Each structure stands twice: as C-alpha cells, then as structure tokens.
Design an enzyme around this catalytic site. Structure first.
Site, short mmCIF file in Angstrom:
data_model
loop_
_atom_site.label_atom_id
_atom_site.label_comp_id
_atom_site.label_asym_id
_atom_site.label_seq_id
_atom_site.Cartn_x
_atom_site.Cartn_y
_atom_site.Cartn_z
N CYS A 9 -10.08 49.31 59.12
CA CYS A 9 -8.82 48.73 58.66
C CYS A 9 -8.83 47.21 58.77
CB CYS A 9 -7.64 49.28 59.46
SG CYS A 9 -6.07 48.61 58.93
N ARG A 52 -5.31 45.20 60.72
CA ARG A 52 -4.93 45.50 62.10
C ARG A 52 -4.28 44.34 62.86
NH1 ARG A 52 -10.36 47.44 64.61
NH2 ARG A 52 -11.23 46.66 62.63
N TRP A 67 1.41 48.28 53.92
CA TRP A 67 1.58 47.70 52.60
C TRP A 67 0.19 47.40 52.03
CZ3 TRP A 67 3.75 45.23 56.95
CH2 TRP A 67 3.00 44.17 57.48
N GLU A 90 -6.88 47.07 46.44
CA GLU A 90 -6.87 48.52 46.49
C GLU A 90 -6.33 49.11 45.19
OE1 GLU A 90 -5.49 50.28 50.42
OE2 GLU A 90 -4.63 48.26 50.58
C1 HEM Z 1 0.10 46.85 57.30
C2 HEM Z 1 -0.72 46.63 56.27
C3 HEM Z 1 -2.08 47.35 56.13
C4 HEM Z 1 -3.05 46.92 55.34
C5 HEM Z 1 -3.01 45.64 54.47
C6 HEM Z 1 -4.16 47.83 55.44
C7 HEM Z 1 -5.33 47.67 54.75
C8 HEM Z 1 -6.33 48.59 54.73
C9 HEM Z 1 -7.39 48.65 53.74
C10 HEM Z 1 -7.56 47.68 52.55
C11 HEM Z 1 -8.18 49.67 54.07
C12 HEM Z 1 -9.40 50.15 53.27
C13 HEM Z 1 -8.67 51.16 52.38
C14 HEM Z 1 -9.49 51.87 51.35
O1 HEM Z 1 -10.45 51.26 50.78
O2 HEM Z 1 -9.14 53.07 51.10
C15 HEM Z 1 -7.63 50.31 55.25
C16 HEM Z 1 -8.15 51.40 55.91
C17 HEM Z 1 -7.52 52.04 56.97
N1 HEM Z 1 -6.30 51.72 57.53
FE1 HEM Z 1 -5.23 50.07 57.21
N2 HEM Z 1 -3.84 48.84 56.33
C18 HEM Z 1 -2.54 48.59 56.76
C19 HEM Z 1 -1.83 49.40 57.62
C20 HEM Z 1 -2.37 50.47 58.29
C21 HEM Z 1 -1.66 51.30 59.25
C22 HEM Z 1 -0.16 51.15 59.58
C23 HEM Z 1 -2.53 52.22 59.71
C24 HEM Z 1 -2.37 53.34 60.75
C25 HEM Z 1 -1.39 53.29 61.68
C26 HEM Z 1 -3.81 51.97 59.09
C27 HEM Z 1 -4.94 52.70 59.32
C28 HEM Z 1 -6.06 52.64 58.54
C29 HEM Z 1 -7.18 53.53 58.63
C30 HEM Z 1 -7.37 54.69 59.63
C31 HEM Z 1 -8.06 53.17 57.69
C32 HEM Z 1 -9.42 53.84 57.43
C33 HEM Z 1 -9.25 55.21 56.82
C34 HEM Z 1 -10.51 55.68 56.14
O3 HEM Z 1 -11.57 55.76 56.81
O4 HEM Z 1 -10.42 56.01 54.94
N3 HEM Z 1 -3.68 50.90 58.23
N4 HEM Z 1 -6.50 49.62 55.64
C1 LIG Z 2 -1.70 52.67 55.69
C2 LIG Z 2 -2.38 52.11 54.46
C3 LIG Z 2 -2.42 50.73 54.21
C4 LIG Z 2 -3.07 50.28 53.05
N1 LIG Z 2 -3.10 48.97 52.73
N2 LIG Z 2 -3.67 51.15 52.22
C5 LIG Z 2 -3.63 52.48 52.44
C6 LIG Z 2 -4.30 53.42 51.45
C7 LIG Z 2 -5.81 53.30 51.55
C8 LIG Z 2 -6.23 54.20 52.68
C9 LIG Z 2 -6.18 53.77 54.00
F1 LIG Z 2 -5.77 52.53 54.33
C10 LIG Z 2 -6.56 54.65 55.00
C11 LIG Z 2 -7.00 55.94 54.68
C12 LIG Z 2 -7.05 56.36 53.35
C13 LIG Z 2 -7.50 57.77 53.02
C14 LIG Z 2 -8.87 58.13 53.56
C15 LIG Z 2 -9.78 58.46 52.38
N3 LIG Z 2 -11.20 58.22 52.65
C16 LIG Z 2 -11.91 59.50 52.75
C17 LIG Z 2 -11.76 57.46 51.52
C18 LIG Z 2 -6.66 55.48 52.36
F2 LIG Z 2 -6.67 55.82 51.07
C19 LIG Z 2 -2.99 52.99 53.57
#
Ligand code: HEM
Ligand SMILES: Cc1cc(N)nc(CCc2c(F)ccc(CCCN(C)C)c2F)c1
Ligand code: HEM
Ligand SMILES: Cc1cc(N)nc(CCc2c(F)ccc(CCCN(C)C)c2F)c1
Ligand SMILES: C[C@H](O)[C@H](O)[C@H]1CNc2nc(N)[nH]c(=O)c2N1
Ligand SMILES: C[C@H](O)[C@H](O)[C@H]1CNc2nc(N)[nH]c(=O)c2N1
Ligand SMILES: [Zn+2]
Lengths: 413, 408
Positions: free
Chosen positions: A111, A114, A283, A288
């Site tokens: 992420c 964070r 958000w 994305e």
């Molecule tokens: C607040 C603004 C946030 C932004 C801008 C953000 C941004 C991102 C982005 C760009 C990714 C890669 C996503 C993808 O390519 O599918 C990601 C992954 C992830 N985010 Fe964040 N996120 C946010 C909030 C959160 C929150 C609130 C959580 C959990 C409490 C979270 C948990 C995760 C997790 C677990 C992943 C990896 C999931 C995976 O392996 O597919 N994010 N985030």
């Molecule tokens: C909380 C939040 C913030 C943000 N900026 N974007 C998203 C959607 C992208 C996203 C994540 F981040 C985290 C997890 C997944 C799904 C996991 C899919 N895995 C297998 C490619 C995801 F699709 C969620």
C-alpha cells in the site's frame, strides 16, 4: 538473520537502517536461491496454535500504549489464556480491535497510501447476525466514507471465524464495482474483470440492466449461510463523469467511475483471530483508474478509441501513441475528480508522501515493509521518487491476507 | 519442486525447472525479500566450479561423458594443480560469454543472446593493447549504425594485484562538471570519473556532451588515458517529428551502449575487464539519462517549450514531457538508421524469449524490477508477467570501482 539491514535511495543517497524485519512472522515465498518478489500470490487454529499468537499481539498492544508488564497487561494475558482454554478462542477488546485494524494497514507492504494509517475509522460489526444486518452496516460504511466527496478511510469488521463453517463473507471483491457481461460473439460489455462475479449474481436472481456501468449488487453471507442479494441505494454511490480540460470530445466517450475504492474480499488477521469479512475503503490514486481500470487490455481497453480521437498514428509502436493517450486519460481522470470535489491523489503526490512516511517509520519504528513491485505506479515509474528507493519486503502481523473466493468453498444449504 | 509463473493478462502459465540448477545466492530469505536492492579463489574452490562448467559445456554440445569430456576434466584438474588456475578453450570462452548474457536476469534484450560476437583479448598485456582492442570493438559493434552485439574479454584475474580494468563505466559517456555556482554541467552521473580524468591530465573542453577519454588499467598498473578516435563515436542529434523547436534544445546522444565495469565469471575464473555492448532501448536515454533528477534533468525545460501548466503535479506535465522526449529519441535514431528498440517492441520480444526458454531450457531467470520499463509499465506485457529470479552461472557480476582498491 543479520540485526541491521540498510536500504539506499539512489537519487538522494539517503541510507536507512531497518531493524523491524526481526519481527517478521510469516513467509514471503522467497528462499536463499529464488526470489518470488513478482509472484502475485506466493480448518481453524488449534488451542495450542492460538496461545502464542494471542500473547504476541497482546504484548505488542500493551507495549504500544506504554503499559508493558503492567498489572492490566498481565491480567489481560491471563483472561485471554483462560478464554482460549475454556472456549478454544477469544474476543478482542474494542481498543485492541481498533489497534489491530490500524496496524494491519500500517503493515500492508503493497500500500502506497499508508501515511494515513492512523486516521482509520473502525466500525465494530461483531454483533451482526444476518445478511440484512451486514447490508445495513455496509450502507453506513459507504455513506460515512463517501462524505459527499470528502472521502474518509474506514473499515467495517464483521464477526471472526469460529469453526470455518460459519464464515461471514462479502462475496463482492469491492463494495462498488461495475458489471461485466460476456456476449455470444465473444465481446464483453461493461468491465471484463467482473464477468465471473456478475454471472453469479445473475444466477442468484439479479436482474441485470446490461449496460456499460451497472453498479453490481451486494452479495452477502452471514454465519455461513447462503449469500443474499441487496441493491446499494444509488444515492449512496458517488460517481464522477470523466472529461478533459482541453479535449471537448473526451466527454463524448461516456466514461465515468465511482468515487469510493473499497476492498471487501480480504481477510484481517489479528492475534491469531481471522476476520473473513472486513471491508475497508480509502480514496483513489488516479492511475488505478486511468491506467489499470481503463487501459489494461483485459479491462475497459480504451487506448485505441482515445488514440483515434487524438488522431495519432497507430501503425508504429515507436510513435508511442499508447503512452501519449495514456497520459491524457490520466489527466482527464484527475481533472474530473478535482472538478467534482471528490478526493483523489495523483501518483507524484502519493509517492512523495510515501517516501516521507517510510523515512518516518524507519526513524520511529525501525523500518517499513514495502513491496517495490506494487508501490511503484504503473506509469512514469522512474519520475516518481519510489522508483529509486530500495525497499525491504517482509510480513508483520496484524495483517491483511488473501483468501479463496467464497463460491469456491461454500457448502450450499 | 516445479514452480509455476502466470501471466495475468493472457493467463498463460509456465513451469520452471531450471531454477533447480542454481546455487549462487539471491540475498532473500524465507522471511525477507530483497528483490528491490540493487547490490545485495583457491585450487580448493576452483575445480568444482571448473567441473560444473565443463560438465554443462559438454552437456550443451551433446557429448556429456564423451572421451573429449573426460580428457578435458583431467586436463583442467592437472592445470589447477600445477598452476592454481586454468585457461579456457576458445570454444568454452565463447559459450561462457553467450551464457552469461543468457543468464542475465536483469536484461530485457536477451532474445539476441546467441548472436554475440566474442573478441578474445587474453593475450593483451598493456593499456595500449587494451585501447587497440577496444577501438576495434567499437568500430565492429557500431557498424555505421547497424549495431552488432559484442564483448571483448581481457585476461582473467590472477592474484588480484594484477587486474585488468576498464575504469570507465561505459566505453562511451559524457563528462560531468561541478560548477562554481553549485550546479552541474554535462552528465552528473560522471562527475567523479570526470574529475579523476582531469586529475590524471585530461584537458576538459567543459561542454555539455564531451566524450570522456578511456582510462585503462592493465596487469594491475596505474591506468592510462586514451582518446577514442572521434570518427569511431557515432552520435545522434535529437529532434522531434512535430515540435520543430526541439532541436534548438541542443541535445544529442551516442549510439553505442557499452558496459565496461562489470565482471564476467566463467567456471570460477574472473574476467575483471570484459566490455560488452549491444544497442539501446529508447527509454534508457529518454527516461533515465535525460529525466532522472540526478541526471540531465531536462523535463522542466521541455515542459516550458510545450507551454504546459507546471504549478501542480496533477496536471501530469512531467508525464506529458516525458512521452515527447521519448518520441524524439526514437525518431532521431530511426531517422539516422541507428539501431534502437522501443520499450513496447523490446518487452514483446522478451515475452517471446521467455516462452522459448521455458520450452527448450525449463525456465528463464528474470528480474521484474529491472525488466519492466521506467515508463508506461502496465501497458507493456512484462508488467503482467510473473517472473522467477535466480542466479545461474556463467554470469555478469558487479565489482567495486577500481579507484577504491588501487595502489599507485
Ligand atoms: C487512503 C488512501 C489510500 C490509497 C491512496 C491507497 C493506495 C493503494 C494503491 C494504489 C494500492 C495498489 C492497488 C492496486 O494496484 O490494486 C494499494 C494496495 C493496498 N492497500 Fe492501500 N490505499 C489507501 C487506503 C487503504 C486502506 C484504508 C487500507 C486498509 C485499511 C489499504 C490497504 C491496502 C492493501 C492491503 C493493499 C494491497 C492489497 C493487495 O495485495 O492487492 N489501503 N493501496
Ligand atoms: C482501500 C483502497 C484504496 C485504494 N486507493 N484503492 C483500492 C482498490 C485497489 C486495491 C487495494 F488498494 C487493495 C486490495 C485490492 C484487491 C486485491 C486484489 N489483488 C489480488 C490484485 C485492490 F483492488 C482500495
Ligand atoms: C542487444 C541489445 C540489448 C538491449 C536492448 C538490452 C537492454 C537492456 C536494458 C534496457 C537493461 C537495463 C539497463 C539499465 O537499466 O541500466 C539491460 C541490462 C543488462 N544487460 Fe542487456 N541489453 C542488450 C544487450 C546486452 C548484451 C550484449 C549484454 C552482455 C553480453 C547485456 C547484459 C546486460 C546485463 C548484465 C544487464 C544487467 C546489468 C545490471 O545487473 O546492472 N545486455 N539490458
Ligand atoms: C549492453 C547494453 C545494452 C543496453 N541497451 N544498455 C546498456 C547500458 C545500460 C546498462 C546495462 F545494460 C547493463 C549494466 C549497466 C551498468 C549499470 C550500473 N550498475 C551499477 C547498476 C548499464 F548501465 C548496455
Ligand atoms: C531501488 C531500485 O532497485 C532501483 O531504483 C532500480 C529499480 N529498477 C531499475 N530498473 C532498471 N532497468 N534500471 C535501474 O537502474 C533500476 N533501478
Ligand atoms: C506479475 C506482476 O506481479 C503483476 O502484474 C503485479 C505487478 N505489480 C502490480 N502493482 C500494483 N499496484 N497492482 C497490480 O495489480 C500489480 N500487478
Ligand atoms: Zn525475494
């Protein structure tokens, strides 16, 4: 393992020292002889497995509130131990639940967002018993987190797993997503990523509008029962029509997207407890939508139509017509969200924030696990500061984990 | 165990068995991945390494266990005994140099690996000799713009006090100058090396695109300065197919990319001087060389001339300028008939290469962090390609800069 590990930034020469990796818990998939860093994914806990996992988390929590070794710490350990003995599980206190959820985000190596980890609104839904009640909790989550476009990060946590036959699950992969429909001629209408889940919904009784941007229904499973369908009230689904500041024709493409990204298929692990329904939302980073959702070949795949309207030569790859159209699409996405006052962050701002966050974590926490393959954005990677930043990847707990899709495991009633 | 890699765009699944043949370390453990870290003998140690390599050579020509194979093993054994090292046969040198390229997990250009011209320079004894060998390399590989891959192999390391070294990091590079007012003229990647050349007598022209001299060390002696004859240095003025003002930026680059600071390891022998060259992928110039903050850093100037709004990042003015710079680079090389490959074509070839290697060889080590191009990542097919990274030998390895080890 060595006690200190150094990472270097090759553009600024800053060197950081990681000691936090010594608390690594689970496996990365790599070995001494092979690295699985680009692999996307590299019956419950017994009483004996649970004891040490709970103590580790409880210790970590009391250390965080500066009460390690205190009477309340020792009492909590004893009360958890007794509870595991008599019931082979235990319940988290509200304080521990909130701490656990925040840290699972803090520990999420993939992420980039964070820096915000400590400002997560945690909704306790462990009293929920039915899919209607899950629907109520999720509607409240969506309305709170949307906030008329001033988005707020949030998580809703349903009851933990017991024997594995009573799981709470949100069958949707995200709370808000668009349907995809396979056509007899092989083309796809809507979003090709969601075709499988769309067909499931249709089989469960959903009447599909069969349009390009149909919000899917919620498919919700409580206490191991068969899942049930619910329509999200459309006034709760904030959407942004995509237009371009220069190209007046861009709005004629009829593109839009939803404001709230909300992952609902992951598993939250806290102190050996497993919360299989824990939808969380933040958000968007513009890429994305503008790169992946729109320009992936197996997704909406709009590069060609944009390039046509831009009147680019599309016969030679070396004209970089794809790259040129990809930028304009991402310009439009950011411009449309900002015009409608819906929170969004561009990839330059987000990665600069993440570098500042990572440096702070190294200083105040001893490290920050980060998955370079996921942190670097899918366009213009090397003109973002994360491209040049060495990162260490490792798994801390509490954490968010993948789990099997529920239609593959559910025992239909 | 057999390991599977999936492409998430095509859903193609490949099965890797080749990783079972590696024994060099990656730097990762079961608990920590270092996939984004850039850098993580004796008669006793030598013969097993020698034997392994001879074994795979004779296995590659389908004479494993032959009389020739048996004789070579004992010949090598007696030589490590009586001399503490051994010399490769010519065929072995060529095989080992091609396979070090084939094994380079970080190289997207490996579809070409077996089209490599190998220049044996093991009889070289002086820096003048090295200079002659290198000029011949440059002339051959440049080929008036129809670039040809090549490597020149200087004598192997003996005791570590008599190393052959090319002190330059690439054969052809532009000088960088620390300015009085604090900034940098030329290429900031090379400020230190440029200063060493000035300190050794080189008279700098103090321009923007001054070709550095060669600084060559033979048999552990002090290095010596040489000017590559300018007619051997092919350069390309960068212009843009639509922005006629682009040529007024005064930009150019050299056509021949030629890495000269790595170490080639074959059968436990170490070749500390082995310059190798191919041809450019356009993003190497257009994204990294021109637009890294610590490089030429021209994004601001370009975006100025495009009259883009540069007050907020979210206008993506940097991304817009980046694409135009990369259009210009490709257009200029192609207009001058200098070999160059765009990142879409290059990554497409690499997916096809991966497919070939899984079929005939059982896998292909690959470093996603380096394979994915520094722009437009996910619209190239490698972004969606899972890759297994592991270390096979023969290999290219990094080594320390000679000015941190050498005694004058
Ligand atoms: C607040 C603004 C946030 C932004 C801008 C953000 C941004 C991102 C982005 C760009 C990714 C890669 C996503 C993808 O390519 O599918 C990601 C992954 C992830 N985010 Fe964040 N996120 C946010 C909030 C959160 C929150 C609130 C959580 C959990 C409490 C979270 C948990 C995760 C997790 C677990 C992943 C990896 C999931 C995976 O392996 O597919 N994010 N985030
Ligand atoms: C909380 C939040 C913030 C943000 N900026 N974007 C998203 C959607 C992208 C996203 C994540 F981040 C985290 C997890 C997944 C799904 C996991 C899919 N895995 C297998 C490619 C995801 F699709 C969620
Ligand atoms: C023929 C055309 C070639 C192309 C298009 C090509 C492309 C590339 C690119 C784009 C990189 C990343 C470089 C960087 O980011 O600095 C790379 C890395 C590399 N290339 Fe190739 N290359 C070619 C030929 C060769 C040859 C002939 C050799 C050796 C005989 C070679 C050996 C390597 C090695 C060892 C690396 C990794 C360097 C490291 O670990 O830092 N390449 N290649
Ligand atoms: C043979 C060839 C083809 C091509 N297309 N580009 C190049 C130059 C880029 C490049 C490489 F490939 C390989 C190695 C280096 C040295 C990088 C510096 N180390 C310390 C990371 C390099 F800078 C060389
Ligand atoms: C820290 C990170 O490993 C470093 O910036 C790497 C990332 N990927 C790269 N990829 C290529 N092709 N070239 C590079 O120099 C780098 N640098
Ligand atoms: C094969 C590869 O691991 C896969 O394409 C990954 C690469 N990096 C990614 N990075 C992000 N942010 N999101 C992704 O879906 C992926 N996909
Ligand atoms: Zn690894």
């Amino acid at each position: 393992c060595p006690r200190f590990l150094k990472v270097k930034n090759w553009e600024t020469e800053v060197v950081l020292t990681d000691t936090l990796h010594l608390k690594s818990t689970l496996e990365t998939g790599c070995t001494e002889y092979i690295c699985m860093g680009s692999i996307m994914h590299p019956d419950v806990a017994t009483k004996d497995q649970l004891f040490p996992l709970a103590k580790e988390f409880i210790d970590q929590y009391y250390s965080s509130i500066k009460r390690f070794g205190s009477k309340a710490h020792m009492e909590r350990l004893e009360e958890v131990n007794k509870e595991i003995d008599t019931t082979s599980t235990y319940q988290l206190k509200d304080t521990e639940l909130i701490y656990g959820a925040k840290h699972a985000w803090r520990n999420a190596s993939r992420c980039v967002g964070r820096i915000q980890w400590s400002k997560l609104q945690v909704f306790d839904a462990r009293d929920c018993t039915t899919a209607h009640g899950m629907f109520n909790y999720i509607c409240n989550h969506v309305k709170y987190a949307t906030n008329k476009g001033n988005l707020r990060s949030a998580i809703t946590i349903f009851p933990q797993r017991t024997d594995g036959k009573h799981d709470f699950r949100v069958w949707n992969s995200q709370l808000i997503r668009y349907a995809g429909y396979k056509q007899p001629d092989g083309s796809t209408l809507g979003d090709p990523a969601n075709v499988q889940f769309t067909e499931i919904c249709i089989q469960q009784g959903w009447k599909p509008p069969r349009g390009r941007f149909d919000v899917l229904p919620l498919l919700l499973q409580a206490n191991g029962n068969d899942p049930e369908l619910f329509q999200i009230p459309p006034e709760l689904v904030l959407e942004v029509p995509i237009r371009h500041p220069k190209f007046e024709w861009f709005k004629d493409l009829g593109l839009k997207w939803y404001g709230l990204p909300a992952v609902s298929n992951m598993l939250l692990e806290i102190g050996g407890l497993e919360f299989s329904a824990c939808p969380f939302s933040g958000w968007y980073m513009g890429t994305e939508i503008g790169v992946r959702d729109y320009c992936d070949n197996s997704r909406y795949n709009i590069l060609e139509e944009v390039a046509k309207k831009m009147n680019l030569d599309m016969r030679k790859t070396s004209s970089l017509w794809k790259d040129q159209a990809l930028v304009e699409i991402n310009i439009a996405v950011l411009y449309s969200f900002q015009s409608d006052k819906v929170t969004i962050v561009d990839h330059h701002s987000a990665t600069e924030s993440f570098i500042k966050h990572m440096e702070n974590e190294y200083r105040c926490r001893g490290g920050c696990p980060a998955d370079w393959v996921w942190i670097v954005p899918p366009m213009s990677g090397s003109i973002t500061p994360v491209f040049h930043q060495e990162m260490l990847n490792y798994r801390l707990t509490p954490s968010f984990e993948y789990q099997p899709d529920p239609w593959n495991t559910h025992v239909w009633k």
